[PDB]
Design a protein around this ligand. Structure first.
Ligand SMILES: [Fe+2]
Length: 186
């Protein structure tokens, strides 16, 4: 039974229920994420920005079934074109806007990567990606508004690949956290 999450903490409780089993109902997870109305006071603890690039701030480890984190994007900050390591990846905007660009998996031949489509994700919207859908890049293209997003990955993963837009070549990246449970990482 899917109910509206009243707060971020309630959302987390609901997610624990939805991930209690071995599979994931993507549409249900997306619907509950979308139903949570961002409340900046509830997530201020996690919204730790860096001058130079976006930050990843761990919120919950999902009893091992998922990682829930908050990403903080300064003006002009963006990601690589990347995959999601055979995991489900949900992204919900909590503040601002992000541009998501979709790309196809590269051919083995070196070529300029093919941009499929683009969209602007607005406050409170929840998007979904997985490797079967394709690759993506996420960027805060704003000059004036920092963005904050809530990401859920299941199973958790700590490495992925970044892809060179000019060639399709991939490199393994290890993801790092800026903070965990509100506490800065050393
Ligand atoms: Fe992503």
């Amino acid at each position: 039974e899917l109910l509206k999450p009243r707060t971020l903490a309630d959302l987390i409780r609901i997610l624990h229920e939805l991930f209690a089993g071995d599979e994931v109902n993507v549409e249900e997870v997306q619907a509950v994420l979308e139903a949570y109305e961002s409340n900046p006071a509830e997530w201020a603890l996690y919204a730790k920005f860096d001058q130079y690039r976006y930050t990843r701030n761990l919120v919950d480890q999902g009893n091992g079934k998922f990682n829930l984190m908050i990403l903080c994007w300064g003006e002009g900050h963006g990601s690589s074109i990347h995959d999601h390591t055979d995991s489900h990846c949900f992204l919900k905007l909590l503040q601002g806007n992000l541009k998501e660009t979709l790309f196809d998996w590269p051919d083995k031949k070196s070529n300029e990567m093919i941009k499929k489509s683009e969209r602007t994700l607005r406050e409170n919207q929840c998007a979904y990606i997985n490797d079967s859908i394709g690759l993506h890049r996420v960027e805060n293209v704003s000059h004036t508004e920092p963005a904050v997003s809530l990401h859920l990955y299941s199973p958790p993963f700590d490495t992925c690949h970044a892809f060179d837009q000019r060639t399709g070549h991939k490199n393994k990246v290890t993801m790092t956290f800026h903070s965990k449970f509100g506490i800065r990482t050393p």
